[PDB]
Design a protein around this ligand. Structure first.
Ligand SMILES: [Zn+2]
Length: 358
C-alpha cells in the first residue's frame, strides 16, 4: 500500500506525510495566509491545508449559475487562490483542501489538486465519493465517529470506480481531544483490516508530540495537526492549535521517531493512548453517525406521485433535523422512483415516503 501525492510517496517505506492544517487561521488577511504557509514550510511539513468552502452549503442546498454568487459560498476570496498556490509551490509545500459536494469538487479540480480530502461527516456521501474517485487523484478520508462498516463502504465505493490511491485517517471529532480519547489501537486494526489502504491520524489533542509520535510508532503514515501563527489570537481555531515552534517540534518528534524505528528502537505506547481497538464513536462525540453524517433531504415540497430527482432531494447534513435515508439510496430514488405521500421541504426522507401501505 503506497501512492504519490504530487512528487512524494505516501505509505510502505515512505516517510510519514505531514499535513499542517491552517483552517481559517489567516483571519481573512492574505499576508497572514502567506505567514501560515511560511510556518508550515519552516517546520518541515509536507502539506499545508486551507478551508476553501463555507459550512452553510453542507446543511441547506443554495440556489445557469453566476460566478458572483459562487464566490459568496467560499471561505477565502477567489483572488487569493492562484497566489496561495504559487506561494506553496515556491516554498515547496503541497497545498491541500477539503471538498463536500460535486460543486466544491469541481472548483478544487480546476486548480489541479494533489489529493482530495473528505471530512468525517461526508464518510457516507457515497455519490460524492464516487464522483471524486473518478477524477483519479489520491483520496484522504477521515473517520470520526465511524464504525468499521462505514469505513468499509466508503472504501469499496472509491475502489469500485477504479481508484486505488486511498488513505484513511483515524480521528476524534472533539476539539481539543483529551489524550484518553485518542484510541490509537485503532490505527493497527484499520491497517490489518484494509491492507491496501494507507492509514493516518488527524490529531485534535493539544500536546505537540505525545499523540503524533505514539501514532507514528503504531504505524500511521500521515499525521494532520492544526497550527496557527499565534495561539492568543481571538480564537478562530487559534487557542488549541500549535504555534510555529510547536509545529517544528512535532515534525522533529515524528522524524526522530521514524529514524529510531529504522534502528530497531521499540518504545511502547501507554494504556491511556491505546484505548480500545473497537472502531466506534467516543463518549465525547456520542453517535454522530446517526445525527451528524449525511442523509437524503427534500430541497422543496414533494407531492404524492412526484418523481424524485436532483431537483427536489439532496445529500445533506441534518443539522438539528431528524436524519434522512442513507445516501446509498440516492441513485435508486433519482432513477424514476416516486413519492407515495406529500413530503414537506427540508425534511429527511423516510421509508414511509416511498413504500406503499394502502
Ligand atoms: Zn480538524
Amino acid at each position: 500500500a503506497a501512492f504519490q501525492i504530487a512528487n512524494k510517496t505516501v505509505g510502505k517505506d515512505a516517510p510519514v506525510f505531514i499535513i499542517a492544517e491552517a483552517g481559517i487561521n489567516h483571519d481573512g488577511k492574505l499576508d497572514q495566509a502567506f505567514a501560515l504557509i511560511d510556518a508550515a514550510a519552516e517546520a518541515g511539513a509536507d502539506a499545508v491545508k486551507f478551508q476553501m468552502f463555507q459550512a452553510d452549503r453542507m446543511y441547506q442546498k443554495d440556489p445557469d449559475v453566476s460566478i458572483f454568487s459562487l464566490v459568496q459560498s467560499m471561505e477565502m476570496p477567489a483572488e487569493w487562490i492562484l497566489p496561495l498556490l504559487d506561494y506553496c509551490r515556491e516554498k515547496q509545500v503541497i497545498f491541500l483542501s477539503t471538498v463536500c459536494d460535486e460543486g466544491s469538487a469541481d472548483l478544487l479540480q480546476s486548480t489541479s489538486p494533489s489529493a482530495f480530502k473528505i471530512a468525517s461527516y461526508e464518510i457516507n456521501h457515497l455519490p460524492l465519493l464516487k464522483y471524486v474517485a473518478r477524477l483519479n487523484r489520491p483520496m484522504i478520508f477521515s473517520t470520526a465517529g465511524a464504525e468499521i462498516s462505514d469505513v468499509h463502504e466508503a472504501w469499496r465505493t472509491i475502489r469500485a470506480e477504479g481508484n486505488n490511491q486511498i488513505a484513511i485517517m483515524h480521528c476524534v471529532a472533539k476539539y481539543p481531544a483529551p489524550p484518553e480519547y485518542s484510541n490509537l489501537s485503532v490505527i493497527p486494526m484499520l491497517a490489518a483490516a484494509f491492507p491496501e489502504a494507507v492509514i493516518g491520524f488527524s490529531d485534535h489533542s493539544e500536546h505537540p508530540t505525545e499523540a503524533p509520535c505514539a501514532a507514528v510508532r503504531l504505524g500511521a503514515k500521515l499525521i494532520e495537526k492544526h497550527f496557527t501563527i499565534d495561539k492568543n489570537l481571538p480564537g478562530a481555531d487559534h487557542s488549541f492549535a500549535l504555534n510555529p515552534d510547536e509545529l517544528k517540534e512535532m515534525v522533529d518528534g515524528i522524524r526522530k521517531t521514524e529514524a529510531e524505528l529504522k534502528q530497531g528502537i521499540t518504545k511502547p505506547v501507554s494504556e491511556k493512548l491505546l484505548g480500545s481497538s473497537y472502531k466506534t464513536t467516543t463518549a465525547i462525540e456520542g453517535e454522530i453517525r446517526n445525527f451528524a453524517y449525511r442523509g437524503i433531504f427534500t430541497t422543496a415540497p414533494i407531492q404524492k406521485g412526484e418523481a424524485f430527482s436532483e431537483d427536489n432531494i439532496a445529500v445533506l447534513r441534518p443539522g438539528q433535523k431528524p436524519q434522512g435515508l442513507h445516501p446509498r439510496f440516492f441513485e435508486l430514488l433519482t432513477s424514476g422512483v416516486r413519492a407515495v405521500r406529500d413530503i414537506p421541504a427540508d425534511t429527511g426522507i423516510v421509508w414511509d415516503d416511498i413504500l406503499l401501505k394502502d
